Amino acid sequence: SMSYSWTGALITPCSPEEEKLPINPLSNSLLRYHNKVYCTTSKSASQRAKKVTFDRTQVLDAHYDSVLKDIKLAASKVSARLLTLEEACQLTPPHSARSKYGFGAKEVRSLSGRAVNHIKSVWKDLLEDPQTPIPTTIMAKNEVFCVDPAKGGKKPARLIVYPDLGVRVCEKMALYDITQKLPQAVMGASYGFQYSPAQRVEYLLKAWAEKKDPMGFSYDTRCFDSTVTERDIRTEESIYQACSLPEEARTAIHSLTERLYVGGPMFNSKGQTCGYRRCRASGVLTTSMGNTITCYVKALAACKAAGIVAPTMLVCGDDLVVISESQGTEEDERNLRAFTEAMTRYSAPPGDPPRPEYDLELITSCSSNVSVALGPRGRRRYYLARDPTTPLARAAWETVRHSPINSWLGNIIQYAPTIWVRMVLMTHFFSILMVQDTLDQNLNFEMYGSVYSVNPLDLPAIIERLHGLDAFSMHTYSHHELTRVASALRKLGAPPLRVWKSRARAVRASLISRGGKAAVCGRYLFNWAVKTKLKLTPLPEARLLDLSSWFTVGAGGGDIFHS
Amino acid sequence: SMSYSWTGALITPCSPEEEKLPINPLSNSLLRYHNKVYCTTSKSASQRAKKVTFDRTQVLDAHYDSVLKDIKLAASKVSARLLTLEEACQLTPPHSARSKYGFGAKEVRSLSGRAVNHIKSVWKDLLEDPQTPIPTTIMAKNEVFCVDPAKGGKKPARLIVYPDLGVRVCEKMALYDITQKLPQAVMGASYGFQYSPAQRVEYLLKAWAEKKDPMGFSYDTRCFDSTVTERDIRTEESIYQACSLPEEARTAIHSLTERLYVGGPMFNSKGQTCGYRRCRASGVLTTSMGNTITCYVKALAACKAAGIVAPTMLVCGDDLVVISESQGTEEDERNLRAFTEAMTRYSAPPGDPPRPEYDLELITSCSSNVSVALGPRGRRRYYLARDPTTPLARAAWETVRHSPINSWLGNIIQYAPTIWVRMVLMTHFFSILMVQDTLDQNLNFEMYGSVYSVNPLDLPAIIERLHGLDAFSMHTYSHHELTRVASALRKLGAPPLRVWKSRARAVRASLISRGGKAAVCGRYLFNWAVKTKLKLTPLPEARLLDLSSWFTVGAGGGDIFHS
What we know:
The structure is a homodimer. Chain A is built from 21 helices and 16 strands. Chain A has helices at residues 25-28, 45-52, 62-75, 85-90, 105-110, 115-128, 165-187, 197-209, 224-227, 230-242, 247-261, 287-306, 329-345, 389-400, 408-414, 419-436, 459-467, 479-492, 497-513, 516-525, 540-544; strands spanning 4-6, 37-39, 136-140, 144-146, 159-162, 214-221, 264-267, 273-277, 312-316, 319-325, 350-352, 368-374, 380-386, 443-447, 450-454, 561-562. In chain A, the strands form five sheets. A five-stranded mixed β-sheet of chain A has the order 1-8-7-3-5. In chain A, a hairpin with a 5-residue loop joins β7 and β8. In chain A, α6 (115-128) crosses α7 and α10 runs antiparallel to α11. Chain A binds chain B through residues 74, 77, 79, 180-181, 184-185, 187-189, 194, 210, 377, 465, 516, 519-520, 535, 537-540, 543-549, 551, and chain B through 74, 77, 79, 180-181, 184-185, 187-189, 194, 210, 377, 465, 516, 519-520, 535, 537-540, 543-549, 551.
């Protein structure tokens, strides 16, 4: 079947769109080459639509059947409950797309207006009707990148397909508890979203170390969501239903599967019929969990098909890393081709052919890699790194155009130990917060696909809890990290690191002059900028924060919230 | 001055006391030699009173003045707030000693009866009157031990000295926030109560590793509370007051210091005047924090006096470990004598002279030592161990006489990776919980001096969070751990480990037959008892638990609660 069919109606914007980075003295002090920064818009929706539309064929085999049998057995030891309406409402992000039925996120979160009665009505209809397709809206995402001259120029917008807010709340009542329990039960240590960046690094280090002669690869599926078949989605349902669930949840889960998850009609923002979907919806609660489980089953089965020796996997939605025992140069290349051919039969063909790697630091997981630097007293510290170009480009856009749900804060938290976060993002944003006099205001951001709310003054505690006190004393960064950052700064027309150091000394002094939590930010976040360094003590707040749970699957379009 | 003066009136029981372990088929199946197990009672109060009563002289010097100056500077960066009455009430343990003024812990926790109005009245009196000594009650603690023939036989009861429940709630309003923030600020990594057992092991490993040639010792102060002088306690106040505090807190803290902390009259349970105290009260909120800070100041100053080279300390109340650079056998012995002489001038004379140790595993912190075993795939795992004799003796008593606040559950959690917890305590208590049909009931226990509430069915998640999945797969225990446990079991007349293994196989099967969380306990806690072992996956609940904060100073008599 085809992943999508189309009527010819346009994918239309629901609001004015801007493609070019606006000029502005605040953003200009971060980077000058604003014509290199662009935002995707509906203008390129048609191009994306073409890419994500294709035929799927799927031929399964004994390896697949055996893996699925195991997964269902493991799933049978899981017990999950319904969420109450109030609980599901509290998980709705502040700016979640408003309903067509006369209420928005504000009303959901406060249990006011039409919200409660409408959501109750939707739930009852799910229990009574397991058949009628539920309508969805398709939209072009507005996301910011830096041009890549020698690589095609500009990426087309991603497409997001989602049902009404009322349905999204019902999804949580039916399935949120399952998202919290099922992935770990069926995939164990392989489930990537259970890990903080530090824990992901630790897992990868351990996986690598336990092989006599390690070989790893990442596998890039072309347009994962579109490769997911109706049968795949019904198989996800059979896994959900293997858990112990109350009848009412079983009923709602089956209805959501047949009315929403497996496919349905898509409309544009104008209300015109735009097409029909027969693949994964990109904006539902189960997008991430579903992709993770389905990638895992296909990938484990393909390892068996290929004869991969002692696979250890890290799976994050459609992002796949496989570490195993090397069988030699030529055998590894051969086995990787067999792996790809099996994945292809299972409907998950490759975007770029996988490559065997024999150095752990070359393996990418979710655009990130392991890097190493020195902490206090020369000890080696491993941490997660990435290319800073996209983060820096988005930081610039978000300085001039305020995003209700930003990305710079998510990047500071996830990549806190990196040289670019420490010297550039922290310096720039603490300066901006002081200019705005908004240091002590909670901000919403996205991380691991979902929404969080944090007060920038709590960053030292958050960073310590997630990355350790060493995040504040890292030095002797790797050559790759140093070239990576210098290159990105030059490319974007940003000041070089030596200029950022000068800037940070002043930002630090200004924070310290304010006393209180602002002074803590100055002392801890900017210890790197002074020659007479302070000895930093463990922050009490770092333990007092409830954060252990922070990292979970999340949702499609990230429609899950935690403050 | 003398630590105490006495009137001659008796230290009297407030309830019937039992000295001998009762016989009972449930407790007998744990250990048969019941005449070896005893409980301290008021019968031996007089003997303890003699031991804790002595003259104190204190001569300070430039090393002490310099350390204190530093501590106050660090304290000045701390900001703390008052707790509201409601907050302080929620921190009161369910069975806290009832007030003389017609209410108990139940009324405090529910904010009902006379409790609120009485506590308000006490607070106002603290603000108005900084002078009048506050009365306290002195009691003999009832604690269980095993006889030590060749070591004096039976220990006398410890004494506990505490003010009325109403005052104890006011202490929390005034000072709880300080307990959460100040120790880490002034002592940094040295503050021991911030660490879980695993983190304590990690700290000690790191401290040892960072010395070119490590030497460590523990220092045992004779009767620490009694060595604490009125000046010491007023110095603690000056440290508290160095923080940024609201005037009302400053006022209450000064009044509590002068009316309660520095000394005051003691009465027995009959209401007779028993004596007067001029040293640390053993049952106040500040007992642990106070002892920790005062031990730290004296110990750091004494290191300077002695010329100890590069001290790294771990301080837990009066429990002190010092790791430093060895200066050679003879110089180390000499320097340790100088350290002791300085501690002695500062009023903290030794019970047993400190001994230099050159093997990390021989260093004791809070009766515990580092041990090592093998986890999955042969990797070395370090963890905290102790002698199991006292835990086993108390487990027996608590099987036949139910304690409102027990110790066996605290021991299972703290020492989860140990062979005795895994094979003996877990087997015995899960069996007992099934006999009683109370598996799924919250239990209160003491840990690190304070009270916690846990449901035994949550143990696998708690254990994983605190100790890692390896707690469930440890093998190849050390020779010392093996001899230690075999010896203790023989001494107490308990079955040998091979019998416990047989017992556990049946307990495991019974848990698994029950499904649900009980089956999880069977699979995870008792994987060691089966030859065909299950592969255990990470438990979702382990992250979903808010536990990062669990470990803090606590309070005297442990009058702090967290469910």
